[PDB]
Amino acid sequence: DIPQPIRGDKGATVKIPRNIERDRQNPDMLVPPETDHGTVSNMKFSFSDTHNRLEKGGYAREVTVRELPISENLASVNMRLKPGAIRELHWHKEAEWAYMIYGSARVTIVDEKGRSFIDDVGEGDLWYFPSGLPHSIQALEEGAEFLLVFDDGSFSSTFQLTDWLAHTPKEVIAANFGVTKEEISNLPGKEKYIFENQLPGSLKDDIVEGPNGEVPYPFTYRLLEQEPIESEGGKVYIADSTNFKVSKTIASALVTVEPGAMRELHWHPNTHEWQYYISGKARMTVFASDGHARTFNYQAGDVGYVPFAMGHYVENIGDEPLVFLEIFKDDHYADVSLNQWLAMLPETFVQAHLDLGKDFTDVLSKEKHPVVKKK
Amino acid sequence: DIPQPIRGDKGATVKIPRNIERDRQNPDMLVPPETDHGTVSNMKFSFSDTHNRLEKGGYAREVTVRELPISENLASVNMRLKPGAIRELHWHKEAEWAYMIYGSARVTIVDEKGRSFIDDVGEGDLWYFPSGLPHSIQALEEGAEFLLVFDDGSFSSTFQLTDWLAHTPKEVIAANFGVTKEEISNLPGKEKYIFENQLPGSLKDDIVEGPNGEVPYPFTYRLLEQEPIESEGGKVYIADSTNFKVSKTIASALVTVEPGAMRELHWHPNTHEWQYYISGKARMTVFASDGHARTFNYQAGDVGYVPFAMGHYVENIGDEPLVFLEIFKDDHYADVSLNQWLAMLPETFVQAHLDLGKDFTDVLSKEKHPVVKKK
Amino acid sequence: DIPQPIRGDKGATVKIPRNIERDRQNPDMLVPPETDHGTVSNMKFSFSDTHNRLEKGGYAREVTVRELPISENLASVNMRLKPGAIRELHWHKEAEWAYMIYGSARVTIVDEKGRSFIDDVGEGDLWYFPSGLPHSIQALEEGAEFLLVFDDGSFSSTFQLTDWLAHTPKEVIAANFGVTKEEISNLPGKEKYIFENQLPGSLKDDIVEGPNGEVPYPFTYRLLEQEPIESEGGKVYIADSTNFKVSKTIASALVTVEPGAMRELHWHPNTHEWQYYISGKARMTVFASDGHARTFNYQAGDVGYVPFAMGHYVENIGDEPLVFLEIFKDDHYADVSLNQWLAMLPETFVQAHLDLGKDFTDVLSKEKHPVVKKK
Amino acid sequence: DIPQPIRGDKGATVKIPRNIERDRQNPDMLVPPETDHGTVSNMKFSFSDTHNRLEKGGYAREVTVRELPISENLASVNMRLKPGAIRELHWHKEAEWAYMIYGSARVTIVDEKGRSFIDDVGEGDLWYFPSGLPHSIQALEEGAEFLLVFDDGSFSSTFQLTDWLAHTPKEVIAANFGVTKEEISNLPGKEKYIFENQLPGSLKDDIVEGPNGEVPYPFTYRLLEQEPIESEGGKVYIADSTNFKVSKTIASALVTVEPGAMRELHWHPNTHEWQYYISGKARMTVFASDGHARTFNYQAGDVGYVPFAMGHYVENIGDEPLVFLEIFKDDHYADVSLNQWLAMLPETFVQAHLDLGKDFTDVLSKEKHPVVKKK
Amino acid sequence: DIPQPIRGDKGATVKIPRNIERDRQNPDMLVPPETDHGTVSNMKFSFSDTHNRLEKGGYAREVTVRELPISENLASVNMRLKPGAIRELHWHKEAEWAYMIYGSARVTIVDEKGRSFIDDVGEGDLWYFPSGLPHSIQALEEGAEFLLVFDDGSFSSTFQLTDWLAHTPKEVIAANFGVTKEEISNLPGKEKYIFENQLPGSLKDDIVEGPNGEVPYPFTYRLLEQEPIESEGGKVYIADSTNFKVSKTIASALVTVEPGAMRELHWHPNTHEWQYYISGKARMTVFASDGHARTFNYQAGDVGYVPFAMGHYVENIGDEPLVFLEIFKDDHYADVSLNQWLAMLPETFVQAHLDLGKDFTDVLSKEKHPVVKKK
């Protein structure tokens, strides 16, 4: 049907030409809760509203501070590789965190002591590459599609192996390696970035031994192999520097919310939250203090954000599971639950605040249930 | 059908959950021209992706620098009023320009010499209110829906008459007017902002005479009553400070592009362009120098932007007329046409640049045709 | 009498209308030391020159970067609560440090693991609440008046429990707790902030047990129960992260200077100093390098500041004890004493600098005496 | 010989490896005047210390805010073209001012009304291109070497005709001009920037007539054909918006100072001065207030700067004429002469300031002599 | 001879007056590698292009962000002291690192616990003074010349002992020490900064004992007494916080490159590199990503810079050893070698990137050789 911005005796029909498909995606923005108030920055952006860079072997598109200006500290790329296709050997200033949504890939990294790590990553697995350490990605037989998160919102360029070489004098490259200019005459004249290639062999045949030893901590993590926090309406899997040891600047949670359930009312006492919606449909109200609150809708492909310590919840508003990531630029994950907070205070003190009685304080739980199901 | 980000042997199918409706709206973003290159800021945002403020009497939603960070100098509100409904008497730091898309409204303004101007505005008419001059809007019998543009991208609050009074000591208000506190006890305790009211009478019965004379220049302009620049594929109506005399800080063009036509390749030598798409479907490539270019799609409800002097065109990609506004924070409208530029140079000099011959330079026109039709 | 800005043959009588009471408070500003020189930022502001927010149950007033722009990293609130009155359950981005000047209060805090801490605080006691951890204050039978310091100078709003709830959809609150909308219909429609309430019972009856254990470190500290550094002219009590373990971002000293005594010539090698004058009258010269120095006067109710590493002293210029706080945004307190510095160098090297002899270097002490008494 | 940083009993021999050739170029920096004092920003940079971009047809090198950070508002390019060589048709945000040091060139410009201007420029002639108006340069039979000044210090890229076309979809270019894609298949795939070409014919055969009329004001100026201000030690030729009418944002003076002469003590009351040293050797002291002053040396190829209203002089310290440009981002040239200032005051008032008598005030001149010769 | 900016069929002779001596110093800037491309900030500045502050006892000159704006985090002073001459007792906000290029000096430092450290430093030795800790330098019988590096690029003033005292009221100084105003009447009226003095006695006779114990870590380091990393073409000596324990904010390497050798292709994965060229002649290309690269020349007296993670090499282009320092604002030194990186990957994966075969991958070394010699 044709939604209208009308809530009781407020609002009016739209009389100008309009985008009905977007209005249908944003029911809580066309018709917000009457409890929303005040100016709040935009906290929502879709990867579908970005330019897609197409290459022989896949694609990449990005959501940065140039698209979502509230997110100054975190930026993201949605990258797709065809079977065997390679994301060229490269490095950058930013640390990189990744979640494998579809397929599988082989990654390489070499550290500043010349120690190498090569591993395969499947659906639900993570990687984290510390700032400036060079790495590559190669999709295996299914291809691969993954979300990358960088710990600077201004992320724009990366340093590519073949770009460096194409911009270094040939006589210097030749001197660097002890070869003649003729022996390196076939070097590419420009970057590859993403390129097609044959499927690699078995992981065990790729492992490179060297004089400098094994890396002290792995750069990949099997998130979905861990035991989640399970509550009535869903599951939360947390990876931060306490369990995924190398992941110093990114803390993460994968949240699944069943139909009829919600990520409970909470905030993060440490830093801003950046969100990616893998599947399903949500709404979230962000409470910004001083009587300011604004509700946003999200679905698969959307990036969201919750500035440091703002109150929020994430409600599944669809008939399928809602699956999303909560990402923090910090060495740990932390939340304060509204329910648990109030449960741990004297009941008459809580009653004095809320103008409610024992029938309310009796429902509070001292145990944290990150995802709750509607009764 | 199901679009895919594939262009020849580049790109791949989407393997993750996705937003198919948005992908269908953005065909030149999911599959950009092969001529696009490099990092370019986002130049596109939809009013449908904003929170709608609903009141008794209408609604308002906004696109500001908090949504579209490239647009630091210009922000916009889409406001709707029901019949008789009033946008409360108010003022702000920003100058305000307006285009009436639907219906009609009565406006009031009083200047710094105490001179008043009251007028009715219909579809295709403009207003402009200089910074800090207080004004109101009241929809007539059809109601009204209009686009407001403010000459600061950070636009967020306005000063409302009843809010000022509600935050002034009652004894001061009473002293200001020579009345008792009892005589003003019924003042509202909070702002109205938008409120329902009876239809006003005839314009002529509202005109207020005073000791200070007539305003020197009218604050409204009948844009669509002017003679447009007519070219093969469409029409352009320009209002800037040379014709709409009070409009010192906003220059504007309403452009109509027939199906199969395009706003020609051009740039603006004076300042940034802010766009609103009233109806139809477009694509535009923004050329940013140094080999950077990015293509965007637009449709009804979208805001666009073209930073100062960047090369661009606007192509109708639908079967209905494309109608949009070009807005500039300047005292005049100016463009340089690629066609006219090259037509006014020696033909062999142009040939030396383009590696093309007389058969090309023969097609160039010394006359500017802002909108061209495909052959 | 009537002070005049005259120092020997410099200065002149004031010939315009003037503020004689303020001139009397600022004798070293109306008539500075002849050793002052150059442009130095303002380092002084009075709480009496701020707006006082009055509520049922007390008041609060603040000195922020909007009042004292040199203090970009630290801001402060002077808050007063009547007996039993409650500062509403709330949180904020900033860490909070506090000094109880008058009376006593009960505080609550619940951490990110759901562990609670409830304690009573009396005169001379501190609290510290880490960023984002929710807390409350309730005055006991004497009421309470305390100084709060926040580790951001831009401090302006806090997140209040009842404000969050008033801006969350009722259906979401009901879903969050497993109750009906009817059971929460009496929730307040706006924040309380400060509110009157009955005196609480004994502390031991308020302690809440829970499944998550005791907090690892207490959030309160009995500063005046510690052994001070005692020197001839006064006492210094230091609390930083080395003794008050949770106090990671605020280091503090309470200094008492007897009449005729002075906080010695020193600087802080770690960070800026923020000052609050609890009682008495002072002057301080701030030495800013490159021959710049400016003298300021302070008395009860004043905030002062000393930018990172600037040389200074604090002289009691009255007949009662001078009592003030030195606050640092750091994990430790550190000072370098001019006396001790020179005492620890070879005497002829010091003599070569100062153009003075053994009779001077003989007075230097290798032991640090933070507060010295005039002979 | 080997200069040393020694001035009387101050300074010492250099004991580390050093750059003797640069020390010889900077005698007043290795051994400054004893009257210099305090921290002053760098006001000097050489084009020889910049990367030279070499192309088929010439070269270009630049001094921007990235080289000389004091100069935030003005940047410069030294460009050289071989005979017939073309600086490709282009535009940019910045206004452009130029001085032809060597040879001659033909310029084209087309304005926003489609009016064209084509002219030849020889040694000592200027051009000025308003922001965003497209233009080209083509060297004639001698080739050409010129200094360009842009009215933004951040100047980095320009919009090139063939770059725009190479980044526009071929179907759009074809639609724009009413030609087929096949007819434009030979368009260059990348920019030309600077390219070789045959010498053009006579100027009169290039003039393009059109329907839109003559430009109202010429874009070139014959500076050295004007009557200079002639004083005892040299000559000054001024071009600003009062005589070179289009030159709205750049005011300029070409100064020649004979051996033994100096540009007198003066300042500019309007804005910052940017300098280019065409030939000879200079020193200048910049007086920055508050007892700060620093002396710099300049020679051919150097850029200098004098921030707004700072006191200065320019002394010829060589045996050939010193020739330099003074450039201002303003609509006029203005200076205050120290001599003329004091000459226009009562002599006893001047004597009271300087502690000198009639024998000094008797030498002052009420007439301004910008360049004075040593007696 | 007379160099010209000509590379094959690109470039042209210089036709304007020019700086031939600087052009001869910058052969790779007048004629860059054809592989250079795009806008890159200036990464080079000479101490010879700075004002030299001359005093009785020596000199000091500086390169700060005001000279080299890319270097926002690090600034440097070249200071020279005559025999016995003293750099006055002082402190500052910035941490200070030093390298003794010529001669020897005695340093003093007293920490925040009143512990003193006095030591002699010779050629090749370092010091590091933590922020705000007061210190002095006194040259011994050879005099001294050293490079100081400060961990803020805005470095401008320091706090001097005698300046502090000259700007403190005499009555306060007298009260601080328990002396009369008459006993301190001979204090200097202004700073000394650098001053002549008799040679000190033996180090052992200067050591000051005190009640507070020995400093836990020494403030000097004998860099050239350590075992260097020795490779075919040179030597690298590293001092960071892992070996020079107090040096928390500065990591450093002294690199020696024999004629015909080069510091290999590498980057730093942690932070920006600041360079000082002690002796010899170099070129370096900085690779900035996205196809941007620019080559710079350096010789004795030059400061260089390499922004975080940019690719680079340093080639000796002279007939003597090239000796330079690499400085980082970090707690450790780290590099990634291009050679070692590729050696630690599967050979066919490397071949797939570079379009080269086994004859290339066979030359790669798993061991890092920071300095390589040409074959």
Ligand SMILES: [Cl-]
């Ligand atoms: Cl990437």
Ligand SMILES: [Cl-]
């Ligand atoms: Cl409005």
Ligand SMILES: [Cl-]
């Ligand atoms: Cl508060």
Ligand SMILES: [Cl-]
């Ligand atoms: Cl150019």
Ligand SMILES: [Cl-]
């Ligand atoms: Cl120094």
Ligand SMILES: [Mn+2]
């Ligand atoms: Mn990466």
Ligand SMILES: [Mn+2]
């Ligand atoms: Mn969350």
Ligand SMILES: [Mn+2]
């Ligand atoms: Mn308005």
Ligand SMILES: [Mn+2]
């Ligand atoms: Mn346009």
Ligand SMILES: [Mn+2]
């Ligand atoms: Mn608080």
Ligand SMILES: [Mn+2]
């Ligand atoms: Mn202090």
Ligand SMILES: [Mn+2]
């Ligand atoms: Mn140009």
Ligand SMILES: [Mn+2]
């Ligand atoms: Mn001048």
Ligand SMILES: [Mn+2]
């Ligand atoms: Mn120092």
Ligand SMILES: [Mn+2]
């Ligand atoms: Mn390096």
